[PDB]
Amino acid sequence: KSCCPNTTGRNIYNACRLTGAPRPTCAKLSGCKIISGSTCPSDYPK
């Protein structure tokens, strides 16, 4: 899944996405990152 440091980062990432902006751009606007793994590491749990 998608892997964000904080709730606020998940929120911005999500707001970027909802306003139809592409995933990688939103990922770096937020500072999230993306894995295959169902759960993310302890530092990017959201």
Short mmCIF file of N, CA, C and O in Angstrom, two decimals:
data_model
loop_
_atom_site.label_atom_id
_atom_site.label_comp_id
_atom_site.label_asym_id
_atom_site.label_seq_id
_atom_site.Cartn_x
_atom_site.Cartn_y
_atom_site.Cartn_z
N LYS A 1 0.82 -1.22 0.00
CA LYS A 1 0.00 0.00 0.00
C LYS A 1 0.85 1.27 0.00
O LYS A 1 2.08 1.20 -0.06
N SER A 2 0.19 2.43 0.09
CA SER A 2 0.83 3.72 0.27
C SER A 2 1.22 3.92 1.73
O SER A 2 0.54 3.45 2.64
N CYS A 3 2.34 4.61 1.94
CA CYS A 3 3.11 4.61 3.17
C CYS A 3 3.51 6.05 3.50
O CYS A 3 4.42 6.59 2.87
N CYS A 4 2.83 6.66 4.47
CA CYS A 4 2.96 8.07 4.83
C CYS A 4 3.44 8.19 6.28
O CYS A 4 3.05 7.39 7.13
N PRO A 5 4.27 9.21 6.59
CA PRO A 5 4.86 9.41 7.90
C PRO A 5 3.83 9.74 8.98
O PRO A 5 3.96 9.28 10.11
N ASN A 6 2.82 10.55 8.64
CA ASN A 6 1.88 11.10 9.61
C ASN A 6 0.48 11.17 9.02
O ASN A 6 0.28 11.04 7.81
N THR A 7 -0.50 11.39 9.91
CA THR A 7 -1.89 11.60 9.55
C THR A 7 -2.02 12.83 8.66
O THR A 7 -2.71 12.79 7.65
N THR A 8 -1.32 13.92 9.01
CA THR A 8 -1.33 15.15 8.23
C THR A 8 -0.79 14.92 6.81
O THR A 8 -1.29 15.51 5.85
N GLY A 9 0.20 14.04 6.68
CA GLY A 9 0.78 13.68 5.40
C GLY A 9 -0.17 12.82 4.58
O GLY A 9 -0.34 13.05 3.39
N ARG A 10 -0.82 11.84 5.22
CA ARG A 10 -1.91 11.08 4.66
C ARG A 10 -3.02 12.02 4.17
O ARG A 10 -3.53 11.83 3.08
N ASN A 11 -3.34 13.07 4.93
CA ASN A 11 -4.38 14.02 4.57
C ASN A 11 -3.99 14.79 3.31
O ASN A 11 -4.81 14.92 2.40
N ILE A 12 -2.76 15.31 3.25
CA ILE A 12 -2.34 16.11 2.10
C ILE A 12 -2.24 15.22 0.86
O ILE A 12 -2.74 15.57 -0.20
N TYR A 13 -1.61 14.05 1.02
CA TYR A 13 -1.52 13.02 0.00
C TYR A 13 -2.91 12.73 -0.56
O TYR A 13 -3.10 12.69 -1.78
N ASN A 14 -3.88 12.57 0.34
CA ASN A 14 -5.25 12.29 -0.02
C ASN A 14 -5.93 13.45 -0.73
O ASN A 14 -6.72 13.23 -1.64
N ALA A 15 -5.63 14.69 -0.33
CA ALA A 15 -6.23 15.88 -0.92
C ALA A 15 -5.70 16.08 -2.34
O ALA A 15 -6.45 16.43 -3.25
N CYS A 16 -4.41 15.83 -2.54
CA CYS A 16 -3.78 15.84 -3.85
C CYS A 16 -4.49 14.83 -4.75
O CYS A 16 -4.99 15.18 -5.82
N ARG A 17 -4.58 13.57 -4.29
CA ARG A 17 -5.25 12.51 -5.01
C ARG A 17 -6.70 12.87 -5.36
O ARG A 17 -7.09 12.72 -6.52
N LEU A 18 -7.48 13.36 -4.39
CA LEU A 18 -8.90 13.63 -4.58
C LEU A 18 -9.13 14.74 -5.61
O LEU A 18 -10.07 14.66 -6.39
N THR A 19 -8.22 15.73 -5.65
CA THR A 19 -8.20 16.75 -6.69
C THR A 19 -7.56 16.24 -8.00
O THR A 19 -7.05 17.04 -8.78
N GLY A 20 -7.62 14.93 -8.26
CA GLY A 20 -7.29 14.32 -9.53
C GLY A 20 -5.82 14.46 -9.94
O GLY A 20 -5.52 14.37 -11.13
N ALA A 21 -4.91 14.66 -8.98
CA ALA A 21 -3.49 14.79 -9.27
C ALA A 21 -2.80 13.42 -9.14
O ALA A 21 -3.24 12.60 -8.33
N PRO A 22 -1.77 13.14 -9.95
CA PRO A 22 -1.19 11.81 -10.08
C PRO A 22 -0.42 11.37 -8.83
O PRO A 22 0.15 12.19 -8.11
N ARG A 23 -0.44 10.05 -8.58
CA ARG A 23 0.07 9.41 -7.38
C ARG A 23 1.51 9.78 -7.00
O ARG A 23 1.71 10.16 -5.85
N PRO A 24 2.52 9.68 -7.89
CA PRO A 24 3.90 9.98 -7.53
C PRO A 24 4.08 11.45 -7.13
O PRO A 24 4.77 11.74 -6.15
N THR A 25 3.46 12.38 -7.86
CA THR A 25 3.53 13.80 -7.55
C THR A 25 2.98 14.07 -6.15
O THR A 25 3.61 14.78 -5.36
N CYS A 26 1.83 13.47 -5.83
CA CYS A 26 1.22 13.58 -4.52
C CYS A 26 2.10 12.94 -3.45
O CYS A 26 2.23 13.49 -2.36
N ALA A 27 2.70 11.79 -3.77
CA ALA A 27 3.58 11.08 -2.87
C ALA A 27 4.75 11.96 -2.43
O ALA A 27 5.15 11.88 -1.28
N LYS A 28 5.28 12.81 -3.32
CA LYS A 28 6.41 13.67 -3.00
C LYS A 28 5.99 15.03 -2.46
O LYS A 28 6.72 15.61 -1.65
N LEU A 29 4.80 15.52 -2.83
CA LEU A 29 4.19 16.66 -2.17
C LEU A 29 4.02 16.36 -0.67
O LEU A 29 4.29 17.21 0.17
N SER A 30 3.58 15.14 -0.35
CA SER A 30 3.35 14.67 1.00
C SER A 30 4.63 14.16 1.66
O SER A 30 4.77 14.28 2.88
N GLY A 31 5.53 13.53 0.89
CA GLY A 31 6.63 12.75 1.42
C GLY A 31 6.22 11.32 1.78
O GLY A 31 6.96 10.64 2.49
N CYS A 32 5.09 10.83 1.25
CA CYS A 32 4.74 9.42 1.29
C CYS A 32 5.61 8.63 0.29
O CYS A 32 6.34 9.21 -0.51
N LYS A 33 5.52 7.30 0.34
CA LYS A 33 6.14 6.38 -0.59
C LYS A 33 5.27 5.13 -0.70
O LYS A 33 4.24 5.06 -0.02
N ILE A 34 5.59 4.22 -1.61
CA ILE A 34 4.66 3.18 -2.05
C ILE A 34 5.36 1.82 -2.06
O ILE A 34 6.43 1.69 -2.67
N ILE A 35 4.76 0.81 -1.42
CA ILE A 35 5.20 -0.57 -1.47
C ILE A 35 4.07 -1.47 -1.97
O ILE A 35 2.91 -1.06 -2.03
N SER A 36 4.41 -2.73 -2.26
CA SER A 36 3.46 -3.80 -2.48
C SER A 36 2.85 -4.28 -1.16
O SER A 36 1.67 -4.60 -1.10
N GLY A 37 3.68 -4.32 -0.11
CA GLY A 37 3.35 -4.88 1.20
C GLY A 37 2.07 -4.29 1.79
O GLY A 37 1.86 -3.08 1.79
N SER A 38 1.21 -5.18 2.30
CA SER A 38 -0.09 -4.88 2.87
C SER A 38 0.02 -3.83 3.97
O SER A 38 -0.77 -2.89 4.00
N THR A 39 1.01 -3.99 4.86
CA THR A 39 1.37 -3.01 5.87
C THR A 39 2.72 -2.39 5.56
O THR A 39 3.58 -3.00 4.93
N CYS A 40 2.88 -1.15 6.02
CA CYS A 40 4.05 -0.30 5.87
C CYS A 40 4.94 -0.43 7.12
O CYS A 40 4.46 -0.90 8.15
N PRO A 41 6.21 0.00 7.05
CA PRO A 41 7.08 0.03 8.22
C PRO A 41 6.58 1.03 9.27
O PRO A 41 5.74 1.89 9.00
N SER A 42 7.14 0.89 10.48
CA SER A 42 6.76 1.65 11.66
C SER A 42 6.96 3.16 11.51
O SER A 42 6.34 3.92 12.25
N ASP A 43 7.83 3.59 10.59
CA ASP A 43 8.13 4.99 10.35
C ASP A 43 7.21 5.63 9.31
O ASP A 43 7.08 6.85 9.32
N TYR A 44 6.54 4.84 8.44
CA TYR A 44 5.56 5.35 7.48
C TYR A 44 4.24 4.56 7.54
O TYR A 44 3.78 4.07 6.51
N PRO A 45 3.62 4.42 8.72
CA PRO A 45 2.54 3.46 8.93
C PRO A 45 1.25 3.82 8.18
O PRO A 45 0.51 2.92 7.80
N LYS A 46 0.98 5.12 7.99
CA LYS A 46 -0.34 5.57 7.55
C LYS A 46 -0.53 5.28 6.06
O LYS A 46 -1.60 4.74 5.71
#
